[PDB]
Write a protein that binds this ligand. Structure first.
Ligand SMILES: C[C@H](CCC(=O)NCCC[N+](C)(C)CCCS(=O)(=O)[O-])[C@H]1CC[C@H]2[C@@H]3[C@H](O)C[C@@H]4C[C@H](O)CC[C@]4(C)[C@H]3C[C@H](O)[C@]12C
Ligand SMILES: C[C@H](CCC(=O)NCCC[N+](C)(C)CCCS(=O)(=O)[O-])[C@H]1CC[C@H]2[C@@H]3[C@H](O)C[C@@H]4C[C@H](O)CC[C@]4(C)[C@H]3C[C@H](O)[C@]12C
Ligand SMILES: C[C@H](CCC(=O)NCCC[N+](C)(C)CCCS(=O)(=O)[O-])[C@H]1CC[C@H]2[C@@H]3[C@H](O)C[C@@H]4C[C@H](O)CC[C@]4(C)[C@H]3C[C@H](O)[C@]12C
Ligand SMILES: C[C@H](CCC(=O)NCCC[N+](C)(C)CCCS(=O)(=O)[O-])[C@H]1CC[C@H]2[C@@H]3[C@H](O)C[C@@H]4C[C@H](O)CC[C@]4(C)[C@H]3C[C@H](O)[C@]12C
Ligand SMILES: C[C@H](CCC(=O)NCCC[N+](C)(C)CCCS(=O)(=O)[O-])[C@H]1CC[C@H]2[C@@H]3[C@H](O)C[C@@H]4C[C@H](O)CC[C@]4(C)[C@H]3C[C@H](O)[C@]12C
Ligand SMILES: Nc1ncnc2c1ncn2[C@@H]1O[C@H](CSCC[C@H](N)C(=O)O)[C@@H](O)[C@H]1O
Ligand SMILES: C[C@@]1(C(=O)O)N[C@H](C(=O)O)CS1
Ligand code: SF4
Ligand SMILES: [Cl-]
Length: 346
């Protein structure tokens, strides 16, 4: 019964069986109660501030070949670009001028910048008095250490899938083990660390999703980025099914319930598969939003999956747009850097 599962969730009986049933029940009333629970947990623990992380996708060059990703190295149908360090710093400055309190630098695994150009960029952005989050993929500890010494605050490295067999199949250059080692290293170096996963990957099962939730719980990540898998026509997964919005939303909601004080974005992928998906997600456990701040004529080339959100709007539309979103949700923009504010429990 759906009611028994919600009771257990409310009592924080976070067993595999409970999480599996939560993800297997498709009853609308159960789902809506789950979303309300997550929304209330979000309200109680992280409040009504929605933290804005302005993301600059500063290079779409990648040395890896992940099967799902439009930036994979084998995709020849893609103009590759690299912003210069000056362009990145000035674009970050413009986001700070627009009120962003966190700058996220994300890219393919582009060796050109690594590690020293990243360090120089981070140092310049940190002068602006904002948090800097990096999302550059898997690199040696030495690089992550240099970036931390340069002043980076946070690192996003979604674990993608906690199923090691699936992980290796989809990410043939690496492994779940490596991905986890990178995350443990990031945590060890003092980064606020983000993990997270895609929902609806080919061959991924409900049991895999439970394992994702249990993995996030085990490691108590500061941030959890979750979104559907969205097939990209220029990849081997082009003909696979897109991930389901409601299932993904349930993952976000259960992540909030499991990690009540975590920072959880309403991802662009969620707004891509369902119009208004980000706003729904903000009402079902998420408390972060990541407006796209990549400048034209690059923005349109950073296509991890085929997207329509923000591609045709102005270069600077996204931050004002998310501030309007936050207001029409009756929420507030983050007042500080929006670091995780741990509430220690039992
Ligand atoms: C109350 C008024 C009349 C009707 C007209 C259109 C209906 C919504 C839409 O159908 C979309 C969606 C379908 C889901 O099933 C349930 C939720 C949701 C939001 C519906 C709720 C409600 O029923 C609405 C607002
Ligand atoms: C907005 C729609 C439709 C609401 C509706 O059906 N009516 C609105 C009430 C206004 N009035 C009563 C005055 C209308 C007049 C007619 S009436 O005759 O009803 O008086 C309602 C119906 C189902 C609701 C979601 C679910 O809960 C799940 C979830 C819980 C979270 O916590 C918040 C997020 C989310 C997604 C909820 C959002 C929103 O809330 C929904 C979509
Ligand atoms: C960037 C340019 C030129 C002047 C400038 O370079 N301004 C730096 C501001 C630096 N901060 C944002 C950190 C100030 C925060 C002070 S605050 O008192 O808001 O805490 C300024 C001039 C008018 C400013 C917009 C409007 O205002 C409306 C709106 C207010 C929201 O709020 C943030 C978003 C938005 C769109 C603003 C963005 C940006 O800012 C604009 C374009
Ligand atoms: C109307 C669109 C489909 C549009 C389309 O493409 N046609 C569909 C796709 C995903 C649906 C939402 C999710 O299910 C989550 C949640 C479940 C609640 O029960 C009712 C409210 C809510 C927000 C749903 C509303 C609505 O039903 C959505 C937006
Ligand atoms: C210039 C753009 C378009 C408009 C549309 C929505 C407006 C924001 C929201 O109103 C929430 C909030 C109210 C505060 O009063 C002042 C700050 C803030 C962030 C507003 C700033 C600005 O006015 C916005 C971004
Ligand atoms: N086709 C697709 N559909 C949905 N999300 C995707 C996707 N391709 C990639 N992503 C998501 O985009 C995230 C950022 S990829 C960019 C950062 C870095 N190269 C890295 O791999 O970590 C990935 O973690 C992945 O979960
Ligand atoms: C920035 C990111 C995230 O959840 O941190 N969101 C992106 C998106 O949903 O498109 C993929 S990675
Ligand atoms: S997911 Fe990241 S590492 Fe994998 S191909 Fe895409 S950009 Fe490169
Ligand atoms: Cl962040």
């Amino acid at each position: 019964t759906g009611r028994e599962i919600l009771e257990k969730l409310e009592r924080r009986e976070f067993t595999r069986e409970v999480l599996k049933e939560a993800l297997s029940i498709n009853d609308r009333g159960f789902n809506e109660a789950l979303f309300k629970l997550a929304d209330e947990i979000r309200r109680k623990y992280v409040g009504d501030e929605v933290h804005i992380r302005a993301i600059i996708e500063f290079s779409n060059v990648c040395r890896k070949n992940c099967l799902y990703c439009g930036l994979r190295r084998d995709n020849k149908n893609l103009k590759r670009y690299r912003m210069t360090p000056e362009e990145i710093v000035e674009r970050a400055r413009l986001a700070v001028q627009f009120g962003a309190k966190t700058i996220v630098l994300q890219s393919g695994e582009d060796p050109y910048x690594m590690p020293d150009v990243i360090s120089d960029i981070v140092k310049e952005i940190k002068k602006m008095g904002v948090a800097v989050t990096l999302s550059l993929g898997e690199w040696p500890r030495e690089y992550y250490e240099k970036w931390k010494e340069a002043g980076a605050d946070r690192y996003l490295l979604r674990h993608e899938t906690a199923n090691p067999v699936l992980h290796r199949k989809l990410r043939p250059d690496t492994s779940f083990e490596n991905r986890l080692n990178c995350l443990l290293t990031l945590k060890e170096l003092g980064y606020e660390t983000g993990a997270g996963s895609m929902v609806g990957l080919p061959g991924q099962t409900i049991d895999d999703l439970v394992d994702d939730l249990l993995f996030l719980k085990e490691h108590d990540f500061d941030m959890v980025g979750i979104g559907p898998f969205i097939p990209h026509p220029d990849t081997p997964l082009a003909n696979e099914k897109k991930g389901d919005f409601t299932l993904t939303l349930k993952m976000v909601a259960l992540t909030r319930i499991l990690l009540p004080d975590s920072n959880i974005p309403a991802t662009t992928a969620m707004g891509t598969i369902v119009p208004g998906g980000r706003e729904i997600t903000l009402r079902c456990g998420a408390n972060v939003i990541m407006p796209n701040w990549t400048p034209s004529p690059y923005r349109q080339l950073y296509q991890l999956y085929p997207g329509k959100i923000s591609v045709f709007e102005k270069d600077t539309a996204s931050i004002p747009s998310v501030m309007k979103m936050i207001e029409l949700l009756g929420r507030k923009p983050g007042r500080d850097w929006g670091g995780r504010k741990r509430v220690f429990e039992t």
